[PDB]
């Protein structure tokens, strides 16, 4: 029973990664903590993908606590792909040593998604049900071994001089203002919960009747179904680009609306500053549509605004105003 603070590093608000150590002697890795997946992998010495030679590669041979599982790992995100071999070893996440933890050793990471990525591997934080066969999610090994004070992990996020933070076993109230509002997780796979509606001046632009959304730190934007996100891009002032995309006039924030996510009777506004990422002169929408549709993904755009707490104990998501 212990608590752990993982400083998260922020690259261009699109990737949040912290440091972790694998095996004995400990080998160091940066890993994006992803609440939208349940597999923990790191590059390994068996991987000869460019993404692998330009990132840190775990060497199981150098680790004595390493235990080969033998079972393949292959994961498809919405953005990226990795194939791996499964094994066991000791992961030190901060001050929590997570013994005999199933970790994927990447074999091939085709594509360029991880290649130009800041971090080496991903550490899924979703439910076990999302985890690959043979694979046990990291927080899950922590709970079963009772290494966390409470079966809760909390995320805070963003920028400069700077300090994003993942906390394990606890919640840091200094990262949020107001009170934490607990949203029940409906479907335990993703950190999925119901969003009552999406309003723009009390008007529902999207998410009519209610819709399902997942709190996903590994998603940079705020993804919603095509039609709905369209109606949002037009309801705000965005335009479609000239080499594909949606743009926002940076000088126009003051005149643009607040996009309020209602979750459990409580309002989660996203100001034009939150839903707008600026590249010095050029502002784009933090709203991304899904080629298809259905589930809304509340990414680092929402997470940056709302200190999120993932409670495995009670299958709650606590939401509060980020500091």
């Amino acid at each position: 029973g212990e608590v752990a603070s993982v400083p998260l590093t922020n690259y261009l608000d699109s990737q949040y990664f912290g440091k972790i150590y694998l095996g004995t002697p400990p080998q160091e890795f940066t890993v994006l903590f992803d609440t939208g997946s349940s597999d923990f992998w790191v590059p390994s010495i068996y991987c000869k993908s460019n993404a692998c030679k330009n990132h840190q590669r775990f060497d199981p041979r150098k680790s004595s606590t390493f235990q080969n599982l033998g079972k393949p790992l292959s994961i498809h995100y919405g953005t990226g792909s990795m194939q791996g071999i499964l094994g066991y070893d000791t992961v030190t996440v901060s001050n929590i040593v997570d013994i005999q933890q199933t970790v994927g050793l990447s074999t091939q990471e085709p594509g360029d998604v991880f290649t130009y990525a800041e971090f080496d591997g991903i550490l899924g934080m979703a439910y076990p049900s999302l985890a690959s066969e043979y694979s046990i999610p990291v927080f899950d090994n922590m709970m079963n071994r009772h290494l966390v004070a409470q079966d809760l992990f909390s995320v805070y996020m963003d920028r400069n001089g700077q300090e994003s933070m993942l906390t394990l076993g606890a919640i840091d109230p200094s990262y949020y203002t107001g009170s934490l509002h607990w949203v029940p997780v409906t479907v335990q796979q993703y950190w999925q919960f119901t969003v009552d509606s999406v309003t723009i001046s009390g008007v529902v632009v999207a998410c009519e009747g209610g819709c399902q959304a997942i709190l996903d730190t590994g998603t940079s934007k705020l993804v919603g179904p095509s039609s709905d996100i369209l109606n949002i891009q037009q309801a705000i002032g965005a335009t479609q680009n000239q080499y594909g995309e949606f743009d926002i006039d940076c000088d126009n924030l003051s005149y643009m609306p607040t996009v309020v996510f209602e979750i459990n009777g409580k309002m989660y506004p996203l100001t034009p500053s939150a839903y707008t990422s600026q590249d010095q002169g050029f502002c784009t929408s933090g709203f991304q549509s899904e080629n298809h549709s259905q589930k809304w993904i509340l990414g680092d755009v929402f997470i940056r605004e709302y200190y999120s707490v993932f409670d495995r104990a009670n299958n709650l998501v606590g939401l509060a105003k980020a500091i």
Binding site: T79, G218, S220
Partner: peptide, 4 residues
């Protein structure tokens, strides 16, 4: 944007 990345979609973990």
């Amino acid at each position: 944007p990345f979609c973990x």
